[PDB]
Symmetry: C2
Subunit: 121 residues, 2 copies
Amino acid sequence: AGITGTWYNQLGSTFIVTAGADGALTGTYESAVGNAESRYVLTGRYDSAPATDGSGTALGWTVAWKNNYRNAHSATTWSGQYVGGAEARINTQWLLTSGTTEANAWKSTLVGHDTFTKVKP
Amino acid sequence: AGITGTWYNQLGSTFIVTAGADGALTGTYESAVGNAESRYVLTGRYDSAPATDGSGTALGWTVAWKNNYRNAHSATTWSGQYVGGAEARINTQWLLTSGTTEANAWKSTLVGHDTFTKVK
């Protein structure tokens, strides 16, 4: 039980994460969609001492979409919270920013929401 | 890469970052005052081989708002792009999620935008 483990989003992407004692998130992300192939490095942070009132655990992480196979010149950040329970879940909102010219900056950023579970949908 | 160094937003916050050869962003986010109680660990990633057509360099980072002195039970992610030159900028949009109960989850996430420059 906890953040550390292998998670899958509603699209079948694979989020392999370790939550360190210092508040660090490290691991790999493999996307089922987009200009992406195989695993990408991720790093992030999480609240290592969450409230004890029934609230979830805040967290966030980033993937820059460059690996040894492809480079999409873009990065996604997920911001969200881990919710413990019978079926543990990480509920997130995300921003995907692509590198653009100034004239195209208005359309540089996609927004969405991903929910992660330790069971693959 | 032009990213390593100290950046200032439009509201008096400061971050110091190192952009590693491997695409890592590592540093500290603080207030203009810079007292220890206002400093937090920052980590993220950037495109270490951006396009050469005039496009910006995509990047993102996270700060969880816990340090040795306080804990807001929340985390912000900034997603954006670095634009180089004499007037270098990091243009971002951000998401600040607080830990909530499920009944309050609908109001868990704030959204906004920050522009960072190398000058106060």
